[PDB]
Amino acid sequence: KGKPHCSRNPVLVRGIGRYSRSAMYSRKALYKRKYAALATVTKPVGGGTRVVKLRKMPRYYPTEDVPRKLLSHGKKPFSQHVRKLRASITPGTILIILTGRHRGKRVVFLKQLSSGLLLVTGPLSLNRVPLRRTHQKFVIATSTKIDISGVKIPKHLTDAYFKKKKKYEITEQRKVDQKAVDSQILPKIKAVPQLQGYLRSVFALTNGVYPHKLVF
């Protein structure tokens, strides 16, 4: 029992603290703190009473089994991997899809999800793209920002919202959320000159155009 404090020393570099173990002793104040030193269940049957032993023994055995794996440590399930993001993507940037069927459509990024997929949404008045997930790899992070730091992203939408559950029909829950976030960005993309015309246009490469030659 007690109030569990944060780490007394900060992470200086990953795997390194700012204070030595001799410096952590006096910081922890241990110099004044010498600390010295189941399944058998009986149940009545109306006879007498009987005792079942739960997790009862298996009744069939395959001829051969695989022996157990060795114990490795740096192999964690996907729900506990760290989620990275390019520094060029700041919320309010305009992206360009490359692999999804909205190829080259100019689309607006909003936020990062839990899994690592991104909440990138096109204006449905301009882009015909809903609130959609798209991985950061398939993204052209353009250097064109809009201050979406005043919009209110809905908390009820998450990674499970966009799962392919099981013919697709847009559910009546889905048509609420596309409208509710639109009511702040649709005026914001018109406070910027020639921006709603940018998003209707689709990205493409012409002759004599090289991506490494240009900046976007």
């Binding site: 010498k34 600390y35 010295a36 030193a37």
Partner: peptide
């Protein structure tokens, strides 16, 4: 101190230095 042969008696105050 770290001697296993002649330092048996040596590593004694430290087991009481932790308590």
């Amino acid at each position: 101190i770290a001697h296993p042969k002649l330092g048996r008696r040596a590593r004694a105050r430290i087991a009481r230095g932790l308590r």
